[PDB]
């Protein structure tokens, strides 16, 4: 379930609903991805409280 | 039965997953004595015999259709088949 | 005017507080012209006609103007200026149902609701003095707006419950000329009506409960019949939603006093709700899901209606639903409400209570044994740990002549399986028995008592060596009982020997002091075979 793969297009494959590794669905059923990312940069340019 | 029937419209393609909770959601259905429990179990067994005549669920139904009935056969059941001072205490020890 | 033309307002103010000060000093008849037959119904309805078209039904092409604190007061003043020449409040009440279109950011809706939701505190305010001519028209010749009327009543309801000051008796005519009016509006519920009227009359029948004293509704004395038919058909809707069956049921205190069949229909529609709404395990709601917050918040309110009513009416129902799941999120308020329904009320209460749980789990209802132990384990156990006193006493001596009847000898069928029915109601007999052993004093259990008497035939001269002396015999035997040839129920019976033995502690500690009595119970084992 839990996944960390990386990949240079990678952004593209979650918006298609596909993780960076070419698996997109088990035993064809489809999987419902969230996406976590962790960083910094993106807080230090908020205007509000966040 | 009807909280649980619309997982296996296109979400989930497998319904050997979902199968389980609407056996399950008979089973304490069974066990209460209480009328309205008997009366809504029919209900969901109803939605449960639903599914092959639109799915061809045949390959699989039968083989549960007589496992509920058989359960019964362990229970009784016979209603739930209509619808188809020292001294003394010395002495002793 | 807009926001510039303070002076107009400020006169116009000062004119009306004069002729207020006129009609409260009784010479508003002399001094504006009363001489005709209409006269001052002619100035009252040119000052209402006034205040009432002066908001917008002239500039229906580009917007409503904006009411400011200046004008909020002003009309405020001008209704009551009106309303002081006479008794229009038929006029009145005929202009507040107008379903016209108000062309307006958009909210399109009838005029006299904004009429209305602009001055709300003075309708209500002057409609308290002449009662019954208003109410019974806004009754009879609105059933067809079916929302206007419930508003006009509820601001009614809402201004007699802020007239409470000395002045209750109002609020007792309302209840009486409402309850004589019920059968007025038999079209608000039903199987058709749209959720509006449905919330409406929900929000009548949660006011009036409160602003109709017990007096004059206590049991089938303020018409009954159809109050009573009237919330049935309420709860049986399953077109609602259950946030507001929450407060439906929230307001079951007041209907849990009945005694005839009327109490039986109300289980009936309580069953029907909550097996068509609660879920079998309550876990497939996490949490932040708004249906398991509808869930706790419903079944808090619950145990709340529960906890101010201490009614033996639901709590069957509460615990039914609290056992038939293994373990429930809400345990700790379900316990925290039983000791307090336990604690509040008078003995009798807590009696009633202990013997409703006990023909609950008592009988022989095809249940499971698990749940029949969950059932008396969780809520039996409780409030007897929690229960006040000269209560004990009375359950003992009801109670343990058929215990005891029953823990003899009574070991049979043990063929079809089913003996863990058996040891589950044996098992629960030994827990009653040693939560009733470890609060009861020495000499209350162990002395010239009246229950060790109700216990025997009659009166016993002894001091009580026959029910304690078959006690101890029976968890002797229990939790002695050798398991070499017995392989069918093993883990029910090891609990029922751990009930037996829990139970031989509490009644072997409660009255002996010897340690004698203490190695020659709970320590003499006796190795003979497989003792
Ligand atoms: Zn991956």
Redesign the pocket.
């Known amino acids: 379930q839990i996944?960390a793969?990386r990949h240079p297009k990678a952004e593209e494959y979650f918006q298609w609903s596909k993780?960076?590794?070419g698996?997109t669905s088990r035993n064809r059923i489809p999987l419902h991805i969230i996406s976590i990312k962790p960083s910094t940069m993106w807080f230090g340019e908020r205007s509000r409280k966040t | 039965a009807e909280n649980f029937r619309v997982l296996v419209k296109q979400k989930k393609a497998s319904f050997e997953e979902a199968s389980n909770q609407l056996i399950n959601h008979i089973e304490q259905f069974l066990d209460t004595n209480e009328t309205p429990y008997f009366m809504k179990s029919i209900d969901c067994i109803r939605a449960f015999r639903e599914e092959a005549i639109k799915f061809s669920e045949e390959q699989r139904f039968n083989n549960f259709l007589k496992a509920l009935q058989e359960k019964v056969e362990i229970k009784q059941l016979n209603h739930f088949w209509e619808i188809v001072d020292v001294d003394d205490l010395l002495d002793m020890i | 005017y807009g926001p510039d033309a303070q002076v107009d307002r400020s006169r116009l103010a000062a004119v009306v507080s004069a002729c207020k000060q006129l009609h409260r000093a009784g010479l508003l008849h002399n001094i504006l012209p009363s001489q005709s037959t209409d006269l001052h119904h002619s100035v009252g309805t040119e000052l209402l006609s006034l205040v009432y078209k002066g908001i917008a039904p002239g500039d229906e092409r580009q917007c409503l103007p904006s009411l400011d604190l200046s004008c909020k007061q002003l009309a405020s003043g001008l209704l009551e200026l009106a309303f002081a020449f006479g008794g229009l409040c038929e006029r009145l009440v005929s202009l507040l149902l107008n379903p016209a279109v108000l062309s307006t950011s958009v909210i399109h809706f009838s005029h006299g609701e904004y009429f209305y939701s602009l001055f709300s505190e003075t309708i209500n305010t002057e409609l308290l003095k002449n009662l019954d001519l208003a109410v019974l028209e806004l009754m009879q010749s609105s059933v067809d707006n079916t929302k206007m009327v419930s508003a006009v009543l509820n601001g009614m309801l809402d201004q007699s419950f802020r007239e409470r000051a000395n002045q209750k008796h109002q609020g007792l005519k309302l209840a009486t000329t409402i309850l004589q009016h019920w059968k007025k509006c038999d079209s608000w519920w039903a199987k058709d009506s749209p959720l509006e009227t449905k919330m409406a009359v929900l929000a009548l029948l949660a006011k009036i409960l409160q602003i109709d004293s017990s007096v004059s509704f206590n049991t089938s004395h303020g018409s009954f019949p159809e109050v009573f038919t009237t919330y049935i058909s309420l709860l049986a809707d399953t077109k609602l939603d259950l946030h507001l069956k929450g407060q439906a049921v929230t307001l079951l205190p007041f209907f849990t006093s009945l005694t005839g069949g009327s109490l039986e229909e109300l289980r009936r529609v309580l069953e029907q709700l909550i097996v068509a709404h609660f879920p079998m395990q309550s876990r497939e709601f996490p949490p932040g899901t708004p249906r398991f917050n509808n869930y706790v918040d419903c079944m808090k309110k619950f145990l709340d209606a529960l906890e101010l009513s201490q009614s033996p009416m639901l709590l069957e129902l509460m615990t039914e639903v609290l056992c038939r799941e293994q373990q429930h999120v809400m345990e700790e308020l379900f316990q925290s409400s039983f000791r307090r329904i336990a604690r509040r009320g008078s003995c009798v209460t807590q009696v009633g209570l202990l013997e409703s749980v006990y023909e609950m789990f008592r009988k022989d209802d095809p249940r499971l044994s698990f749940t029949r132990q969950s059932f008396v384990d969780r809520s039996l156990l409780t409030l007897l740990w929690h229960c006040s006193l000269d209560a004990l006493r009375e359950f003992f001596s009801t109670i343990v002549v058929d215990a005891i009847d029953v823990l003899k000898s009574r070991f049979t069928k043990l063929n079809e399986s089913t003996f863990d029915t058996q040891i589950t109601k044996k098992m629960g007999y030994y827990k009653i028995l040693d939560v009733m052993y470890s609060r009861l004093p020495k000499d209350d259990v162990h002395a010239k008592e009246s229950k060790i008497n109700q216990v025997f035939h009659g009166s016993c001269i002894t001091e009580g060596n026959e029910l304690t002396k078959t006690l101890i015999k029976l968890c002797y035997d229990a939790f002695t009982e050798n398991m070499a040839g017995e392989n069918q129920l093993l883990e029910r019976r090891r609990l029922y020997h751990c009930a037996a033995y829990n139970c031989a502690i509490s009644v072997i500690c409660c009255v002996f002091n010897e340690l004698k009595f203490y190695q020659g119970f709970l320590f003499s084992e006796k190795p003979e075979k497989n003792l």
């Open positions: 996944h793969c993780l960076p590794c698996i």
